Every structure is written in structure tokens, then in C-alpha cells.
Write a protein that holds these residues in place. Sequence first.
Motif, PDB file in Angstrom:
ATOM      1  N   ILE A 135      38.677  47.734  40.210  1.00 52.86           N
ATOM      2  CA  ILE A 135      38.246  47.417  41.467  1.00 52.86           C
ATOM      3  C   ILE A 135      37.372  46.211  40.392  1.00 52.86           C
ATOM      4  O   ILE A 135      36.495  46.178  40.008  1.00 52.86           O
ATOM      5  CB  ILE A 135      37.237  48.209  41.864  1.00 52.86           C
ATOM      6  N   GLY A 194      37.528  41.819  40.028  1.00 53.15           N
ATOM      7  CA  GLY A 194      37.438  40.123  40.622  1.00 53.15           C
ATOM      8  C   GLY A 194      39.500  40.193  40.335  1.00 53.15           C
ATOM      9  O   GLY A 194      40.011  39.530  41.588  1.00 53.15           O
ATOM     10  N   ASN A 229      41.679  42.781  41.445  1.00 50.80           N
ATOM     11  CA  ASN A 229      41.689  42.817  42.678  1.00 50.80           C
ATOM     12  C   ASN A 229      42.837  42.053  43.278  1.00 50.80           C
ATOM     13  O   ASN A 229      43.638  41.740  44.358  1.00 50.80           O
ATOM     14  CB  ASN A 229      40.889  43.103  44.396  1.00 50.80           C
ATOM     15  N   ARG A 230      43.240  40.651  42.687  1.00 51.53           N
ATOM     16  CA  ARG A 230      43.683  39.395  42.760  1.00 51.53           C
ATOM     17  C   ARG A 230      45.591  39.831  42.746  1.00 51.53           C
ATOM     18  O   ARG A 230      46.154  40.389  43.107  1.00 51.53           O
ATOM     19  CB  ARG A 230      43.657  38.465  41.870  1.00 51.53           C
ATOM     20  N   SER A 272      46.426  42.836  44.655  1.00 47.54           N
ATOM     21  CA  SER A 272      46.665  41.443  46.472  1.00 47.54           C
ATOM     22  C   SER A 272      48.506  41.806  46.537  1.00 47.54           C
ATOM     23  O   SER A 272      49.106  41.627  47.482  1.00 47.54           O
ATOM     24  CB  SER A 272      45.831  40.886  46.543  1.00 47.54           C
ATOM     25  N   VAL A 316      48.126  40.125  56.605  1.00 49.13           N
ATOM     26  CA  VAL A 316      47.798  41.349  55.627  1.00 49.13           C
ATOM     27  C   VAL A 316      45.884  41.398  55.011  1.00 49.13           C
ATOM     28  O   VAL A 316      45.941  40.093  54.346  1.00 49.13           O
ATOM     29  CB  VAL A 316      48.385  41.578  54.803  1.00 49.13           C
ATOM     30  N   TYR A 317      45.639  42.487  55.878  1.00 48.47           N
ATOM     31  CA  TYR A 317      44.091  42.045  54.716  1.00 48.47           C
ATOM     32  C   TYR A 317      44.268  43.469  54.370  1.00 48.47           C
ATOM     33  O   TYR A 317      44.429  44.602  54.333  1.00 48.47           O
ATOM     34  CB  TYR A 317      42.872  42.559  56.408  1.00 48.47           C
ATOM     35  N   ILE A 318      43.265  43.439  52.805  1.00 47.23           N
ATOM     36  CA  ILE A 318      43.327  45.095  52.283  1.00 47.23           C
ATOM     37  C   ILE A 318      41.774  44.763  51.834  1.00 47.23           C
ATOM     38  O   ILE A 318      41.476  43.556  50.987  1.00 47.23           O
ATOM     39  CB  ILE A 318      44.109  44.632  50.977  1.00 47.23           C
ATOM     40  N   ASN A 319      40.769  45.793  52.078  1.00 54.71           N
ATOM     41  CA  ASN A 319      39.728  46.092  52.330  1.00 54.71           C
ATOM     42  C   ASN A 319      39.883  46.521  50.716  1.00 54.71           C
ATOM     43  O   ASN A 319      40.387  48.005  51.085  1.00 54.71           O
ATOM     44  CB  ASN A 319      38.646  46.342  52.895  1.00 54.71           C
ATOM     45  N   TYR A 320      38.905  46.317  49.536  1.00 54.11           N
ATOM     46  CA  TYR A 320      38.868  47.142  48.377  1.00 54.11           C
ATOM     47  C   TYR A 320      37.089  48.126  48.119  1.00 54.11           C
ATOM     48  O   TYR A 320      36.871  46.920  48.722  1.00 54.11           O
ATOM     49  CB  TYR A 320      38.957  45.776  46.970  1.00 54.11           C
ATOM     50  N   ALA A 370      35.775  38.650  47.107  1.00 57.54           N
ATOM     51  CA  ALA A 370      36.087  39.493  45.972  1.00 57.54           C
ATOM     52  C   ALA A 370      36.724  40.946  46.219  1.00 57.54           C
ATOM     53  O   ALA A 370      38.514  40.753  45.514  1.00 57.54           O
ATOM     54  CB  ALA A 370      35.213  39.507  43.933  1.00 57.54           C
ATOM     55  N   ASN A 371      36.199  41.062  47.277  1.00 56.36           N
ATOM     56  CA  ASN A 371      37.023  42.833  47.747  1.00 56.36           C
ATOM     57  C   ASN A 371      37.683  42.855  48.680  1.00 56.36           C
ATOM     58  O   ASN A 371      38.151  43.551  49.674  1.00 56.36           O
ATOM     59  CB  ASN A 371      35.956  43.598  47.833  1.00 56.36           C
ATOM     60  N   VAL A 372      38.394  41.257  49.106  1.00 52.49           N
ATOM     61  CA  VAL A 372      39.108  41.290  49.970  1.00 52.49           C
ATOM     62  C   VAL A 372      40.385  40.927  49.665  1.00 52.49           C
ATOM     63  O   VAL A 372      40.327  39.682  49.826  1.00 52.49           O
ATOM     64  CB  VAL A 372      38.711  40.842  51.566  1.00 52.49           C
ATOM     65  N   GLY A 373      41.489  41.349  50.164  1.00 48.63           N
ATOM     66  CA  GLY A 373      42.791  40.706  49.487  1.00 48.63           C
ATOM     67  C   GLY A 373      43.536  39.630  51.085  1.00 48.63           C
ATOM     68  O   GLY A 373      43.075  40.732  52.116  1.00 48.63           O
ATOM     69  N   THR A 391      42.484  36.813  46.941  1.00 50.47           N
ATOM     70  CA  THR A 391      41.465  37.196  47.983  1.00 50.47           C
ATOM     71  C   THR A 391      40.630  36.192  47.681  1.00 50.47           C
ATOM     72  O   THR A 391      40.992  35.197  47.572  1.00 50.47           O
ATOM     73  CB  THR A 391      40.927  38.663  46.346  1.00 50.47           C
ATOM     74  N   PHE A 392      39.513  36.597  48.530  1.00 52.21           N
ATOM     75  CA  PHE A 392      39.157  35.496  48.706  1.00 52.21           C
ATOM     76  C   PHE A 392      37.983  34.267  47.852  1.00 52.21           C
ATOM     77  O   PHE A 392      37.125  33.631  48.350  1.00 52.21           O
ATOM     78  CB  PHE A 392      38.038  35.354  50.553  1.00 52.21           C
TER      79      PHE A 392
END
Lengths: 114, 114, 114
Positions: free
Chosen positions: B67, B69, B72-73, B76, B94-98, C104-107, C112-113
Amino acid sequence: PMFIVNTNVPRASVPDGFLSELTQQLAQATGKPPQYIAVHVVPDQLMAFGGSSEPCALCSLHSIGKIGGAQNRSYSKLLCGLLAERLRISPDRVYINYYDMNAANVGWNNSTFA
Amino acid sequence: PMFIVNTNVPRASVPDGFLSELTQQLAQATGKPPQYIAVHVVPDQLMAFGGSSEPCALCSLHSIGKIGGAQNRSYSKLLCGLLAERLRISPDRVYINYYDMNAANVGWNNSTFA
Amino acid sequence: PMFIVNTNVPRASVPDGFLSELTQQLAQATGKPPQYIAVHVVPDQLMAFGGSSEPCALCSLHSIGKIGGAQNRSYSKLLCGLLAERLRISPDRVYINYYDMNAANVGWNNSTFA
Ligand SMILES: O=C(O/N=C/c1ccc(O)cc1)C1CCCCC1
Ligand SMILES: O=C(O/N=C\c1ccc(O)cc1)C1CCCCC1
């Protein structure tokens, strides 16, 4: 504490009293009074574990403290034991995510626990 | 690793083999064996995104490591891509929580990892 | 921001405008435009709170920032108020886990943001 179980086993396979058993076992395991224990069971889910659709469970246990290396191993044995015995789910098809919540990040009755 | 997708898209719109594809794609993406990949799809949900009831999804990807930077991109792009192509959900809904889980905080097979 | 509510209250008891009301109130509470707010309500859940099956709710609020000691105490009042009036759930039978997510942990939207 809050314990959630998501599983593909059918609702009919969930024994009556399972939520009460979880509550009592967790109160004992965490040392927290049962009044602060919340349990949530979600059957009939569309899920796979290792690419297989055989019985499995994805769970989580949130708690303000009482979360740690040795304690988590103990909770895992306890919880996998209950899922195997009551829901017939093999322990190796179960994931349990543990979260040590900061009191300021847990809301309850119009405030937080901080 | 475990991936959960909650969506308002109806169950009938989830194509046959969707969980198998997620398992395979995530195994490749995370570098973890398919055997430890768990996937959970929850359709017909009561949800909104930006106040709109159009197709949307709220997801989470938990993994012990893998997990970060750049990773995660990449996850996503892969996941929004799958949700758009297979479920017809726009990537911007869409929201994806990592979550990078500590091994000691993951239970499995009567114990924990680490 | 993302708000999820899991409750044993029946689907029929969830007002049709509840998701939109939550969206609007949370936009104001977090100072974010409504378009950034996602809401998810899951009724008919098999759950117990304090060993009782009376109406209860297990919730989560995730946000990149806008999470903290004082803000969380305020969100708890806002949310317990909405759950109490719209879902008839006693505020002392509500748990809300707050998560301050790293960008960085939200897609979202293929990236990601961060
Ligand atoms: O009830 C919880 O765990 N801790 C209970 C508790 C016991 C004793 C206290 O003084 C304060 C709070 C929360 C449930 C929701 C997830 C975070 C832990
Ligand atoms: O990463 C995970 O995979 N589970 C086990 C596992 C097997 C093999 C590994 O190399 C690492 C981890 C966990 C899945 C459940 C949620 C926390 C991460």
C-alpha cells in the motif's frame, strides 16, 4: 468494542443466540462490560476467498485499547473457533481485521469517548 | 489482501465471473498469491454520491504492505477501470479507501500474521 | 467524505430523502461541496448493541481532513440527531467510527487524491 462478520453462509445457518454468544464471549475476552459490546452478522454475501466460494468470513473487531500482538492472537482463536463451530467455516478461510481506535475517533451518544 | 465493493448497481448487472476476475487482477496487482485474495461484492445498496442516485461504488482494499503512493494510484486505475467496464460505474462516482494493515492486526487460521 | 450507516431498522422505515438529507447536512458540517459527499445506508441488519436487539446503528465517517477531537464531538451530535429523528434510534445505541484518511490512501476517478 464492535465485532462485524460478513459471510457467504446462509442466514438459516446462523444459530439463534449467536449474537448473544458473541456478545458474552467478547465481553469476557476484552474485559469490557457487555453494555458497550456491539455485534453485527451479515450472511448470504457474495464473496470469495482464494478464488473459492466455499464458506468464508471477512470480519473486523474495533476497540478502544485491548488490541495488541498477544491479545489479537487470543481473539483470533476465540473468534475462528466460534465461526467454525457455529457457522461451519474453516479457520483458514477467515480474515479478521483488528482496529485499535483512539477514543477521540469513536462517537457515541452525542459526543466521543475522549 | 481483501477487496470490498459496495454499490447501488443491481445484482443482475454483476457479470458472471466478476469475483474471479477481481481475484486474478488483484493477485497480479498486489503480487500476492490468489489463495490469499478475498473479494466481496455487495450490490443493490441504498447509496448516493454527490447527492445523485446514479451508479456509484464505495470500496476498500486492505493489505499487509503493498500500500503506498504510487501503488494506490495504480490500484485505483485498475479498479475504477474494472468497475466502469464490468458494472458501468463512472470512475468519478467511486471512492476506494486503502488500508495498510499491520500483520499483528490481521487474524487468520486461529492466529494472526507476523 | 463518506458516511455509512448499518442498522437493524427495516428498509421500510428509512425515509426516501434520508440519503439526500445526510448529504446536505454533512456537506455543511465538513465545509465540503455536496458533490464530494457519499452516503450509504444498510437496513435490516442482524445486530445487537449491549446485548439488545432494539434499534441501533454502527456507522463510519471517513474524510481527508476535517476529523479531530472537537470536530468529531460536533459530528456525533449532528448524526445522532438525524438517526434519532429519521430512524427512531436512541442516541446511546449509536457508534460512529471516525477515520482521518491520508489523501494517498483514497482512490477516486482512476487515481488518488495525493
Ligand atoms: O465501545 C467501543 O470500545 N470501547 C468501549 C469503552 C469502554 C470503556 C470506556 O471508558 C470507553 C469506551 C468502541 C465501539 C466502536 C469501535 C471503537 C470502540
Ligand atoms: O494482506 C492480507 O492478506 N492476507 C494474508 C497474507 C498471505 C501472504 C502474505 O505474503 C501476506 C498476507 C490481509 C487480508 C485481510 C485484510 C488485511 C490484509
